[PDB]
Design a protein around this ligand. Sequence first.
Ligand SMILES: [Fe+3]
Ligand SMILES: [Fe+3]
Ligand SMILES: [Fe+3]
Ligand SMILES: [Fe+3]
Lengths: 339, 339
Amino acid sequence: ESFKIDRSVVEEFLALDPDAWERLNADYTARRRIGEACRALSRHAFVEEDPSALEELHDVLALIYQQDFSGAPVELLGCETQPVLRDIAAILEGAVLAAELDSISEEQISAYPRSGKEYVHWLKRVIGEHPAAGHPFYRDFVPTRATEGDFRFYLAQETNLDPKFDDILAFMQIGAAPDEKMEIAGNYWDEMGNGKPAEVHTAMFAHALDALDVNDDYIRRNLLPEAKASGNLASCLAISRRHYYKSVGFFGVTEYLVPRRFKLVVDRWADIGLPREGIAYHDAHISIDAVHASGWFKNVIAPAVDRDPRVGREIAVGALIRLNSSQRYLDSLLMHLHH
Amino acid sequence: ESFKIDRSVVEEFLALDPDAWERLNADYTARRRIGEACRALSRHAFVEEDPSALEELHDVLALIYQQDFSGAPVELLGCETQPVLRDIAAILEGAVLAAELDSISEEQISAYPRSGKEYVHWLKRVIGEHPAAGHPFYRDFVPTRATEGDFRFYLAQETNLDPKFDDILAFMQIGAAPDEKMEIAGNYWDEMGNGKPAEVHTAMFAHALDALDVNDDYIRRNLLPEAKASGNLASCLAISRRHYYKSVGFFGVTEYLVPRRFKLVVDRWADIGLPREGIAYHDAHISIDAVHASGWFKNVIAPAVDRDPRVGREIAVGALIRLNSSQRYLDSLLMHLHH
Ligand SMILES: [Fe+3]
Ligand SMILES: [Fe+3]
Ligand SMILES: [Fe+3]
Ligand SMILES: [Fe+3]
């Protein structure tokens, strides 16, 4: 009743039994108040730019996307969480995305060539203009200074994304046109080890986490606010059909940048003697994501633009959202690792 | 304002521009009224059992799932449809599922053995008890009487499901445990032609539709109410994490029954001389879905039950939902084809 919403409040919702959820869902006054509380939190996070409200907002979103991405537990199979959780997510997402678009000007997303092959050259040039494409965390800190403790902290941040990449792709390809769908589908099958459990990418990522004891409590204690924002952006864009073309740009940039970044991590990892089985994940992606990137530009981005060049604007927006949010993440990471 | 909701009203929503959607989403009085209208429609459909309200309800749900499953058009990329469409779907789904569970008694879903391999034998026995496992449309009408016009009408009904089976699987495997995920993932890759566009299952299904001119207008004109219900059930169960274990039973029954059904269709199709390229889809699935069924029981159902035997109840519910809804669909189909 004219209340404040935070993560603990949403945990309380998720503890409700199925009848309690049905009663909440029927109460549009309670639901109005929840929405008003979300708008209040959004203003604190992004208008007043309170860092504590910003982290709270991303903690709330992260809890909701956990429900979207995780196998449901038996205890909650009967609980209708969509009317409330989708309202909270729409309000908080709308504020998160509006803040991203505040950093993107019309001049950045409008002068692209309106054909697919040409658009790819333009986008790669635009990516190369952005500092996140050659960030000193990878280019300078990793090869010269990174210790085991640095990599442990870094890997904690990377759990925002890599542990769910297969399901990000599965969400993205829903309803996709044939050429784009086939490329995303092959990418997904690659993520699924092409049928071999040992080669499933989330499994090999978990082995890197094990190698440095990046345990669940360490992650929760050490996850940076911008790491939470990065993970929430990826989830937000993957799970709505309407964000598909942004996602194409967002995960296109991801595939494109992984090989240079991971080569630097892998080389340092070996230099300082860290567990060889620990970088199977990264070593693999050096060649795998080069293929994924080429396939992504040629078979997702270029056909999409050729089908309807208007989507070039959405793809460029998604690319810049990934670049901008990556820059803030890496700057925050490098700042915490320096100190 | 104390209004009646139908498909045309939801089409009106989907015609709103992004600002109009934002204003609707902020208006919890308008949203309360929409929910009340959905509850009214549910009562007409399932309490009063008005056949016209039942078809309207499934027309509304079908339009919403279209948004969930289809590539978003450029014109609607900025429209936040989730707060309203997810409320409508939760209310109408809750009524659809409650009507299904009305036909399922506790004695049917409770005496299963609480281990995976044993559970599979029990479930196959339970399926074999149900009339939909050997329905006369397939067993008697198809081999002895079905004409080209009969198959054209039948294929129109089958568009409720087969054109989206790859994305049903993609939705289902989100967050799934490793053994179950790997099996669903291989099934999905099979649906995606194992990377060969000509072998993509939705593509070969569309060729069967072409062979008999099952065009979009024919489908809309001829789709039976129970065909709409079947398609909506599949969508409902696939898209919520909490319905995962029901989905495991629902699409498990689907995989299990397809080979005997399709063998009968294929044999008749050839007998009456219909286009040979028209049944590439069905001919393939005779052997493919036998493998999919075996894999599904051994690698999805049995590991799930061994992980937590409590889910055996959900899987049995989903299996009976598929069996019951299939029976009503096939009885309605055979009745219309007889007349
Ligand atoms: Fe990968
Ligand atoms: Fe990749
Ligand atoms: Fe298939
Ligand atoms: Fe299959």
